[PDB]
Amino acid sequence: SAMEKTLSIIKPDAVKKGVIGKILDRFESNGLRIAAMKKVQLSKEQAENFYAVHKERPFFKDLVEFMISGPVVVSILEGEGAVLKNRDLMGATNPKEAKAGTIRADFAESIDANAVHGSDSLENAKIEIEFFFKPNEIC
């Protein structure tokens, strides 16, 4: 399915570094089209809603303050195996363990400031895309 879609977030650390274009190019150079995209500032409540599953752990507060500490760029990436391809391009969550040439190897400072988010399954991609985008934004 050449029309598989997944959610990408370029997080506030990478936005502040000014590497939005370099990160987007990793996607477009590797068979993924930017189907939708906007730069947005999340409120505390919005980051809390998006990450409600981590309401669980100690690191929730820190995750939220980070995710609202500046603007992010949210995108729908579309293409064959988009969900897994995005994850492959992002690299392991720990930048120290991320393979060479991955976004997190190249641009991430630490586990906590790890540059990018990507949906981790088709199910979650559907939920995360709906959270950010109305159908008319997908063009």
Added chain:
Amino acid sequence: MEKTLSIIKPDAVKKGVIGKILDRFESNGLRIAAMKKVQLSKEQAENFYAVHKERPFFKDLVEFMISGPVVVSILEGEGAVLKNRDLMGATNPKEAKAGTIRADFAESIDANAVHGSDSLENAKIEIEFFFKPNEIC
């Protein structure tokens, strides 16, 4: 230390060079202050280009600007208006200097990859055209 309007046009969006173009801005003293990918309506493109509506190329121009989606951004930095113009390069891609967006990604005068505001006054106008107060609260 100003703001200017950038549009990555439908030809360049279709080529999938959005990231390469944005990187030209970010690597050269411009920050992306605001940004969205949008599909312009015929109406919207007619309003944007309304100063040229008695010119003979109005029609094709409008048709091209709605032929696919575009990426509209506010670029912020010292001398942004001129800096964006220097990065875009000459209107005619055949005349655009090396390392410019139009030299690398534009096919012709008609399909020339990018728009940029041409003055501070037009920057303010163009920014207000695309980015109105819309944070509901």
